[PDB]
């Protein structure tokens, strides 16, 4: 195995002399090669907030990470790093990380109060915002890093066992571990495609943290994985709430192309930000693409059934099952976030009220279909999943219209049982 330098949302060179160093919601950092040196150009999307600047690269940095306060650079061959803050008040600092024979820096990370540097031999060296060292730790080799505030999330991959991930928090008292090298369910891969595989042996396109406190990962299998309930190890699980193949197929009309990929940028509570790249290569080049937004969809479909019923269109009855799965995951995560962290924007209550109303409404469409096919028993289990008290009243009217008097009395027993538990 060869330890290649990894960067968040980076693209390889290909047949050109320029590429993207890093890419996130703040902006993008790229490099332009000239006759004797390298040239780093940093461009942002929000031109009105920060000042755009550029400088010549004499040392030849190949690693970069961008956060809301500065830019960190790192050299894998000589171990020389440099942190450049956007404000002129803070001064620049340069320090050389010691490296052994054959040791290369594979991934870097930066937070405004701590600096995280990972190597191929598993050396964990942590610095503060001024360069003062605190501790030297020996762990598994880190191949990927992402951070929002305090948290350190490292992906580990050894020579023999490999494929694991760790989750930690750099608190004021001591470093606390929530997960200790749990196995990663990401699928490994079994010319544009050939060149990308060598530079990126694991196929990790991009990785970032969500705005609501949950870690997200996007592997080579093009499935958006959502880590829910990370504060409790008893109920911590991965949730694939979005499937790439289903979203492209429904919007286009019922076909499936090859040259239209989905590169992830950010996720801010409703849609996944992306760049529509059209061409042979899977990596973008220089034009300025407009950012697009894709609506989140659960990957639950059949392929033979969609062709018989015919941009490909989905009917009413089939979409009620997908709407039930999507609303159930989002309502549970939003409830636990507000009861533990509170409000963040100030409009979470209107989102929660609209989501809970659509959840009970979508369940009634499946409830009406069960009564039409005379399945009284399947209709009984659907009534217990209702949350609001007004949804139970609406279930009685669907049952009386379908001429089922025994189903009507069963709804009333659920109502009396919830009122007794509420008074205890």
């Amino acid at each position: 195995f060869r330890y290649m330098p990894f960067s968040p949302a980076g693209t390889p060179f290909g047949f050109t002399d320029r590429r993207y160093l890093t890419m996130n919601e703040v902006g993008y950092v790229s490099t332009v090669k000239n006759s004797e040196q390298y040239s780093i150009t940093v461009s942002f999307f929000d031109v009105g907030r920060f000042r755009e600047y550029h400088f010549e690269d004499l040392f030849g940095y190949d690693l970069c990470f961008l956060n809301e306060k500065g830019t960190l650079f790192g050299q894998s061959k000589t171990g020389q790093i440099q942190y450049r803050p956007h404000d002129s008040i803070h001064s620049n600092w340069t320090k050389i990380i010691p490296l052994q024979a054959g040791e290369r820096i594979t991934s870097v990370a930066a937070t405004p109060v701590r600096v995280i540097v990972g190597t191929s031999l598993g050396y964990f060296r942590s610095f503060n915002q001024f360069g003062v060292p605190f501790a030297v730790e020996k762990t598994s080799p880190i191949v990927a890093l992402t951070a929002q505030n305090y948290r350190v999330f490292s992906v580990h991959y050894s020579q023999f066992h490999g494929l694991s991930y760790s989750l930690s928090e750099l608190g004021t008292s001591s470093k606390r571990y929530y997960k200790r090298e749990c196995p990663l369910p990401m699928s490994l891969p079994n010319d544009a495609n050939l060149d990308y595989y060598n530079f990126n042996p694991m196929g990790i396109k991009s990785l970032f943290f969500s705005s609501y406190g949950d870690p997200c990962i996007f592997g080579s299998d093009n499935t958006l994985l959502l880590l829910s309930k990370w504060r409790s190890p008893e109920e911590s699980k991965w949730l694939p709430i979005l499937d790439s193949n289903m979203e492209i197929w429904k919007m286009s009309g019922g076909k499936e192309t090859t040259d239209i990929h989905v590169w992830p940028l950010a996720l801010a509570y409703d849609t996944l930000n992306c760049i529509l790249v059209k061409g042979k290569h899977i990596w973008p080049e220089f034009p300025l693409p407009l950012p697009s937004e894709m609506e989140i969809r659960m990957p639950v479909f059949v392929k033979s059934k969609l062709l018989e019923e015919n941009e490909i269109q989905i009917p009413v009855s089939m979409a009620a099952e997908e709407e039930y799965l999507r609303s159930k995951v989002l309502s549970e995560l939003l409830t636990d976030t507000l009861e533990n962290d509170g409000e963040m924007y100030g409009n979470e209550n209107e989102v929660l009220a609209a989501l809970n109303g659509a959840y009970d409404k979508a369940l009634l469409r499946l409830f009406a279909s069960a009564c039409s096919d005379q399945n009284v028993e399947k209709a009984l289990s659907l009534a217990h999943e209702l949350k609001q008290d007004r949804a139970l009243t609406a279930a009685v009217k669907i049952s009386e219209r379908a001429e089922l008097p025994s189903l009507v009395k069963k709804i009333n027993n659920i109502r009396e049982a919830r009122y007794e538990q509420q008074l205890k």
């Binding site: 000239n34 006759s35 040239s39 461009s43 600047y53 550029h54």
Partner: protein, 553 residues
Amino acid sequence: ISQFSEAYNKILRNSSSHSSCQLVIFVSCLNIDALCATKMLSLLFKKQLVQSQIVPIFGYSELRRHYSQLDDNINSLLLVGFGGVIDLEAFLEIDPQEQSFRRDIYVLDAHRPWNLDNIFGSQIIQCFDDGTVDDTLGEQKEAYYKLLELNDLSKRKQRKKQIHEYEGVLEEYYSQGTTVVNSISAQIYSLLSAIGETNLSNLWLNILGTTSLDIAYAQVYNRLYPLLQDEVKRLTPSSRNSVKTPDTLTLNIQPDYYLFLLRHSSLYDSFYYSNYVNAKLSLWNENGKKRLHKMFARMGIPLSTAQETWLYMDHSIKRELGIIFDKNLDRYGLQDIIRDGFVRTLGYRGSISASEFVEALTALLEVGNSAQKLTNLRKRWVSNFWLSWDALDDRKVELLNRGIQLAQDLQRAIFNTGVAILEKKLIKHLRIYRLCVLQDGPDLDLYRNPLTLLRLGNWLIECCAESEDKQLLPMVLASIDENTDTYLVAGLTPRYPRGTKKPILNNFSMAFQQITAETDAKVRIDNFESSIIEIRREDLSPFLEKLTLSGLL
């Protein structure tokens, strides 16, 4: 002392209101580089959404009648290159009023002699002092610093001599010739890069001004041969050609020549300014009007396919000159022709480089239009300035070629009389310089506006650019068109045949202070540039008698 990002944010908050909090900038029209620096500053002030007021001023005596009479709540005055030599704070009194003052100008002076008060002892004159000169007369830390405060009969007597020791180092200084060491293109473009705004129009704009100084000095832009190279590669728009895009303004590099405006047109009127290049060799007419007929009429020059042959398949012939002058290289060795240069295109509408482009801007500034005549002469040059400033859009196309066809007769006009004053043989090497007085010829009207005069000297400094292994001194000319013998006399610079080792700036402005200090008998320095003054007819003959003895070089 002024960090470049700091003054921008500081001048931002001082006038950013939606009222008459008007900041106003001033610019001379007598310089091409003075224009192009200002144009890029205005447009970023548009997209930073501030109100403004732009006024040109052509005359140095005019500055009082344009500022010191009309002011209400202007806190932020701005100025481009006016007061490196004469102190404006002595020229214009400003009493200290309201340490954290109430109205602060900047300055964007580009000249070599500075003024010590304007950097040290700064209270309203916030000058541009950043990493421009790190050695701003570095010996000055005790001369004026002990001039500010100035048994003791033997002690103060020594202390007066130390002041007199300080007096000499302020006497040899403030007695130097002037140039521009660094163009104003260099400063503000570096400032915007500290802010970081990516537009190739800027990169098209900043290179224009430094291209203008290619005919006034040599090694100033020889420092900028890297700084042209890195930016066009760092601001690479594309790796492919990505053809048939009418937009996107692609930037490249291609070789080019002293033989100029070729890609626009006329390998015909190249014949004149090929003989300009042979005027750089050993002649002006004689051998060349045989010698040109080995290298030129080899192809008869057509009417219809000459839109194609000296546009396109002259690339077979530019190659052929490229394979002619490679065998004129180890044998002729005249390296005034092959040059690296720079070019741009518009997607369509022909390829236009920046060599010829500065040429159109000079001529279009020229033509394109008691004491009662000078007012109606001074209102012209401001007005015809104005139709050149809007030349930087795509919206001017059929006025762009107007200067082009104007330019290729003005040289034919200026060469028509240069060949006359040679054959008259009225250049006289008296002892120091050579003196020529164009008393009267034809077409005297094109010598009121001084921008033609430096070009006439630029042709005339090169007739004497043979070996001349003694007396490398430029000339002083004379001409008159109007009443009372105004006589806009001027001086030139000596030139080097591409071998500056000796420090040759100017000696005349030192003498120009002398003759102006003598009798004040109708002498004038009201024109802006110190290399041009005026004289009376009965004063030019005692002018030179004061100059043939006052050896100040």
